[PDB]
Design a protein around this motif. Structure first.
Motif, PDB file in Angstrom:
ATOM      1  N   UNK F 139       0.818  -1.221   0.000  1.00 18.14           N
ATOM      2  CA  UNK F 139       0.000   0.000   0.000  1.00 18.14           C
ATOM      3  C   UNK F 139       0.849   1.266   0.000  1.00 18.14           C
ATOM      4  N   UNK F 140       2.031   1.238   0.603  1.00 20.13           N
ATOM      5  CA  UNK F 140       2.901   2.405   0.573  1.00 20.13           C
ATOM      6  C   UNK F 140       3.569   2.595  -0.780  1.00 20.13           C
ATOM      7  N   UNK F 141       3.855   1.503  -1.491  1.00 19.84           N
ATOM      8  CA  UNK F 141       4.543   1.617  -2.771  1.00 19.84           C
ATOM      9  C   UNK F 141       3.580   1.971  -3.900  1.00 19.84           C
ATOM     10  N   UNK F 142       2.373   1.396  -3.892  1.00 24.15           N
ATOM     11  CA  UNK F 142       1.416   1.733  -4.945  1.00 24.15           C
ATOM     12  C   UNK F 142       0.791   3.107  -4.723  1.00 24.15           C
ATOM     13  N   UNK F 143       0.456   3.441  -3.479  1.00 27.59           N
ATOM     14  CA  UNK F 143      -0.121   4.742  -3.160  1.00 27.59           C
ATOM     15  C   UNK F 143       0.937   5.680  -2.586  1.00 27.59           C
TER      16      UNK F 143
END
Lengths: 48, 206, 63, 82, 141, 143, 145
Positions: F139-143
């Motif tokens: 979730x941190x890498x995609x968003x």
RNA sequence: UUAAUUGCGAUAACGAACGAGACCUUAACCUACUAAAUAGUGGUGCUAGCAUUUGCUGGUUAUCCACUUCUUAGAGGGACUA
RNA sequence: UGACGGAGCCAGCGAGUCUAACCUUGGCCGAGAGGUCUUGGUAAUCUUGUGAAACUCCGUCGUGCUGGGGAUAGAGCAUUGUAAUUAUUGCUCUUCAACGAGGAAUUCCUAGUAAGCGCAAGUCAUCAGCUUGCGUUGAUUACGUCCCUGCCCUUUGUACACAC
């Protein structure tokens, strides 16, 4: 309608053809001018 | 004016498309009026649809199919030739790809070119078996709008699958090419050639 | 090809040996009171439009 | 039984799996003005092998002129971004 | 007492129980959001009601859908019918009955099957054939 | 507010877990990988040699996290598929019991997944923590 | 792309392990074209040789060719679990032997003539050219010519 | 007229019997009369991830409250072309 | 619109040891059967949410008779049977002989039926390509006609009445 609109002469009579077709019994039955009827009502001389 | 947001993420573009005015994702059902009076009242118009997959009661009454969508009918006809029976998921995938290809090409209205292809491939004179007596003959019969659209859909589908059999090109691009060719008019697409050959024999034995 | 547009005004009834065709009567948009007997391969119902490549023919009886 | 054929030569394609500068520059000058691009497009309009077409598509997209519309398997669609 | 309404959408065998209550405005299926099941098609299919009605009607409403039975299409159909009926029950029980009526009018105007559960129950199969009506084969000699 | 493998997509999260486990390389691989076909119904072995075992382990661990108690027979039934039995019609065939059992043993050894009472195996505390950490990294890498 | 000289290294038909192979395909499937060894053994050998599969069949080193030669000569010397082989516990000795394109046909002919010489029911069936595995021959196996 | 000697009806027929129907199961809509640790919600007997923000996913009986409006039930409700 | 490799991975009406075993929940080994104790019992609680298949995504094969054929044949492990040898059956390995809308003919299909794919019981000392039931996607031309094959009623002809 087409003949009336393409006619030169107005209020044209538009004649009709008259003929008498004489059928032999076999051909009349085949072409259903007449047909086989029940025995009691074979005596009906009256057309419908 | 404030943005009313929800903690569950929902895309901004689809949120806008919902908030401003009802519409599809990339195609418009507005201003797609046709002059084909013979085929209107059979193709679903003024009824936008979010996804072409619907479990609808369409085969009970007589003309339920008239108000049935035409895109659903095309994706339904795409399931044929035996092993491709069912698989509405695959059918929807292929039709989605075909509409995307017809959108990237021929930048005019994709449903409009689709319907123009349908009308051009829909045969209007056919032949029916007349007994004749011993030697059965053909009789040239006009008049069927429902059969016109039905035969157009069937013809486009079987032409696309005949093109897509035993070759490297995928059914999506084969179908898209057939649709564009039939819509513009090229006398080369298999559906349109079959339709005009049937027309020629119908007029010959007329 | 001269194409004429006509609307079915009464579906006279299904005909043909196998019943696959339907006799209907069609009215022309131009020249009011001009109607022609035509036949149908598929379904046909009330208030249906029609494209005819030629319109100078009639079918009266089939047997 | 019967062979049910005439035993004549088929298409016998020469699908290129290796190329040179003379074809690399041709494909590089040809990949523009292509409204719709896919493996089938490359093979049929270039007369090149499927593997070479796939590699060329990957390399061209990694550099970046065309953008994808669908990443679905068996059907990739790329349109050049003006 | 947290006000929750229990509805359920049905299919051939797909049963989807929907619990619709006053929360933060979320939709979840099996504890996972309806927005992130990633089918790329059935995602839009289940978005259909939410897209057509907007986010105005899910400000603080949590809807939990538990599914069991049927294939993927049957499950998503049960999901959509259950969530539609759950929103209808919410807007009748707590929000205005006029709001429920207009919501159902919009649902019907988009599609009449949105409100009505499908009832094409499978036809039993008879002996002398592989299916319900299909016979085996009529070979004479 | 709220990260969970249910709330994240499956494929990308499992790919991230596979990449992370591949980077760490402390799973104590059985050693006869790259010779097995992951099942008994496959007609062609997998494609990547040093790969796919991270994928199988991630899949089994995530499946255990979804479920409550699951044994090797359940793993084999779950990973099985239709087998092309020549002219005879396709039938369901289970996965490889040896590989499912050995990936369970590897998860046991690494502590991602632990034995449970009443028979079966349950996602462990540290295994769950690592799984959610990988998902949160996603979730941190995609968003 | 990668530029390799247009030398004799590119030939329309080439020789490999006493057979003929056409390139332009994968190396593994070129090995499958070899008689007696197919996709499973080919992929096993390539994977245990740790040569990249996504690479093409254009460039192959002499050390790699000798590597494959030594693998096929002594598969057990290369730690192979000995149940992938096609001849387990042979009748001659009982070791594990991996056939060549010619060796597989010679071995098949040897066991065929062995069955005929020993005059078993299997040997009689193989002599007569019928089905030996117990199939139903009343309606099958007609076009045997 | 649909599947019906199914009916409306005219009538040397009237009144009946058997077949068809009628009947018995099967799948469908029941927020009712009566439900169990076998399908759950909140505090809890024990514990983790997003944190000291109100929740989900988890994992268990006797420690209890409200219900079978999803599985199945038995005097049972409607559909008869309203 | 396919084969394969990987991530999801959905039905119940169906079955089950007492005079000696039924379907299976395992600490150990293998893609395989098998042992030590009973978590299963006189059964909606156990097998079993029967986690069972074309179904959703990233690639390889990619039109060249190819990776669709185990047709066919030879090498090793095994549940069953006091004998599976003329593969009962399962799993590791190979050849390439047919397949460019398939000729005369011939069979089934009105709403979830055609078809595709899968599951359970039957026969059983041991294995389904069968049958009986169920589950997943799902059908354009059918509310029409007797032209073919048959019917039902009436009329009619008959030199038929073991009845064309």
């Amino acid at each position: 309608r087409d003949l009336s609109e393409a006619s030169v002469y107005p209020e044209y009579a538009l004649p009709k053809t008259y003929n008498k077709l004489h059928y032999c019994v076999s051909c009349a039955i085949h072409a259903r001018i007449v047909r086989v009827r029940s025995r009691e009502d074979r005596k009906n001389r009256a057309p419908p | 004016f404030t943005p009313v947001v929800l903690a569950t993420p929902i895309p901004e573009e689809v949120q806008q498309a919902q908030t401003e005015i009802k519409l599809f994702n990339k195609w418009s059902f507005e201003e797609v009026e046709v002059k084909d009076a013979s085929l209107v009242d059979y193709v679903q118009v003024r009824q936008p649809i979010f996804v072409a997959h619907t479990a609808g009661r369409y085969a009970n009454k007589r003309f339920r199919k008239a108000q049935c969508p035409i895109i659903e009918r095309l994706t339904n006809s795409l399931m044929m030739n035996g092993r491709n029976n069912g698989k509405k998921l695959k059918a929807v995938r292929i039709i989605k790809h075909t509409l995307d290809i017809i959108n990237v090409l021929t930048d005019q209205n994709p449903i409009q070119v689709v319907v123009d292809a349908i009308t051009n491939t829909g045969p209007r004179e056919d032949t029916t078996r007349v007994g004749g007596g011993g030697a059965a003959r053909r009789q040239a019969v006009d008049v069927s709008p429902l059969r016109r659209v039905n035969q157009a859909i069937a013809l486009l589908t079987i032409g696309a699958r005949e093109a897509a059999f035993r070759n490297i090109k995928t059914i999506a691009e084969t179908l898209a090419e057939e649709l564009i060719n039939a819509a513009k008019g090229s006398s080369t697409s298999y559906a349109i050639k079959k339709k005009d050959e049937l027309e020629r024999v119908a007029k010959s034995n007329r | 090809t001269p194409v004429t547009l006509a609307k079915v005004i009464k579906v006279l009834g299904r005909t043909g040996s196998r019943g696959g065709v339907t006799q209907v009567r069609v009215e022309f948009l131009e020249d009011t009171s001009r109607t022609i007997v035509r036949n149908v391969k598929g379904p046909v119902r009330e208030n249906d439009i029609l494209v005819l490549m030629e319109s100078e023919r009639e079918a009266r009886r089939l047997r | 039984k019967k062979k049910w054929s005439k035993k004549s030569m088929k298409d016998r394609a020469q699908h290129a799996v290796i190329l040179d500068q003379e074809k690399y520059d041709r494909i590089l000058k040809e990949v523009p003005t292509y409204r719709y691009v896919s493996v089938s497009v490359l093979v049929d309009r270039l007369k090149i092998g499927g593997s070479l077409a796939r590699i060329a598509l990957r390399h061209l997209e990694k550099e970046g002129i065309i953008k994808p519309i669908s990443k679905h398997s068996k059907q990739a669609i790329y349109t050049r971004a003006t | 007492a947290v006000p929750s309404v229990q509805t359920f959408g049905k299919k051939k065998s797909a049963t989807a129980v929907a619990h619709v209550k006053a929360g933060k405005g979320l939709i979840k299926v099996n504890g996972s959001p309806i927005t992130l099941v990633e089918p790329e098609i059935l995602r839009f299919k289940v978005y259909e009601p939410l897209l057509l009605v907007g986010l105005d009607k899910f400000s603080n409403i949590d809807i939990r859908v538990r599914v069991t039975g049927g294939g993927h299409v049957s499950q998503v159909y049960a999901i959509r019918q259950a969530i539609a009926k759950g929103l209808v029950a919410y807007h009748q029980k707590y929000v205005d009955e006029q709001s429920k009526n207009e919501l159902k009018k919009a649902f019907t105007s988009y599609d009449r099957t949105l409100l009505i559960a499908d009832s094409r129950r499978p036809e039993p199969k008879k002996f002398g054939g592989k299916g319900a009506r299909s016979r085996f084969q009529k070979s004479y000699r | 507010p709220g990260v969970s493998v249910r709330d994240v997509a499956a494929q990308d999260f499992i790919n991230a877990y596979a990449s992370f486990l591949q980077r760490q390389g402390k799973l104590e691989v059985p050693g006869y990988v790259d010779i097995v076909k992951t099942s008994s119904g496959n007609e062609m072995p997998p494609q990547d040699a040093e790969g796919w075992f991270y994928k199988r382990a991630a899949s089994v661990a995530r499946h255990i996290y979804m479920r409550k108690q699951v044994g090797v027979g359940k793993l084999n039934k779950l990973y099985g598929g239709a087998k092309s039995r020549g002219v005879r019609p396709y039938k369901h065939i289970d996965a490889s019991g040896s590989i499912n059992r050995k990936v369970l043993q590897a998860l046991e050894k690494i502590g991602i997944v632990e034995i449970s009472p009443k028979g079966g195996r349950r996602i462990s505390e540290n295994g769950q923590r690592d799984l959610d950490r990988i998902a949160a990294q996603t979730l941190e890498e995609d968003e | 792309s990668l530029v390799v000289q247009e030398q004799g290294s590119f030939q329309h038909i080439l020789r490999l392990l006493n057979t003929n192979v056409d390139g332009n395909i994968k190396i593994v499937y070129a090995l499958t074209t070899i008689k007696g060894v197919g996709r499973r053994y080919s992929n096993l050998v390539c994977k245990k040789a740790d040569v990249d599969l996504h690479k093409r069949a254009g460039e192959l080193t002499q050390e790699e060719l000798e590597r494959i030669v030594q693998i096929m000569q002594n598969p057990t010397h290369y730690k192979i679990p000995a149940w992938f082989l096609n001849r387990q516990n042979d009748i001659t000795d009982g070791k594990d032997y991996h056939t060549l394109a010619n060796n597989v046909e010679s071995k098949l002919r040897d066991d065929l003539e062995r069955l005929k010489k020993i005059r078993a029911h299997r040997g009689i069936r193989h002599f007569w050219g019928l089905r030996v595995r117990g199939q139903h021959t009343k309606t099958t196996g007609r076009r045997r010519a």
